Amino acid sequence: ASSFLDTFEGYFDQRKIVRTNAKSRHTMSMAPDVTREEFSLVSNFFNENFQKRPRQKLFEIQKKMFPQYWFELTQGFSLLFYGVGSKRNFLEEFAIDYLSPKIAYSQLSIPCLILNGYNPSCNYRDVFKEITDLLVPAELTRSETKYWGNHVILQIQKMIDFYKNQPLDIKLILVVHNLDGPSIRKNTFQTMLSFLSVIRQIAIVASTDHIYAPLLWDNMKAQNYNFVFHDISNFEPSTVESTFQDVM
């Protein structure tokens, strides 16, 4: 159908013009009709049975990467995990079962705030309210509020200057499932987490799914994030993240 497949030759080659005599006007009316229950049943059968063993072997292979992840987190690098397939079980098992009690033992657990980026109901004001319920920072003075400023960003900027002069002990484990999700990708929300990622006392563990996600960050945001990138491809079913996208 085309002479080139990849690179820019393939991109320009596959953008030809197709005549209306080969329009291929087939539709989804000519499809076997399905509803929620049988689709869910047979889908979960293939997710729990088809290629479960080599996925588990790959998961046990990437369990050995966890001390390197902890060593990267204690040096001030934020963790970003990418790859085809879901990464929710990886981040929940790494942060809660492994990273939190071993960080707690190495500084003699550490709370884990978990953010669901696949949910469009995620909001930076409520998340920062939970952050201030955990870290209990010093409240902003009248002169620091300025003139109709964003109180969240100003209070994080106060916390950055406060936490420069603290002992470098990790007080909080922040997990961001799907950093590139729909409500969560916005510039205010990314500014808030980059400013939180400046603080050495918060460990940032995040995942991503969109292939254009490095476009989200400029030089200032990438400097504040300070990412170490890790390719974890596992072909997980993405059972939970699909619940906010009606597949029917």
């Binding site: 085309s2 820019f8 030759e9 991109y11 254009y212 490095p214 476009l215 030089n219 945001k221 990138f229």
Partner: protein, 93 residues
């Protein structure tokens, strides 16, 4: 600016002031295995002078394709330019 940012800006001007149909005539320089005919280019020279008008809108993938078409350059060297995270960081900048 960096070399990546300057070539991304140059590719952006190319994407904004050329038509997408004529891209296969200017940048295509690859040997063909499967039989196929390259684009002929524009048939007649128009007199609009498109740099006097407002720029047109383009997509990300056309920008990256033209960017690696115009970027400066045995079996493992990978001559062309990949769209890694620093190209996207420069574009965000």
């Amino acid at each position: 600016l960096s070399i990546i940012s300057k070539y991304l800006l140059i590719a952006s001007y190319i994407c904004s002031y050329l038509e997408p149909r004529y891209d296969a005539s200017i940048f295509s320089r690859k040997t063909r295995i499967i039989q196929g005919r390259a684009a002929y280019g524009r048939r007649k020279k128009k007199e609009v002078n498109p740099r006097y008008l407002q720029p047109s809108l383009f997509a990300i993938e056309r920008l990256l394709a033209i960017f690696q078409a115009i970027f400066p350059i045995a079996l493992r060297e990978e001559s062309l330019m990949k769209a890694n995270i620093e190209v996207f960081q420069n574009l965000s900048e």
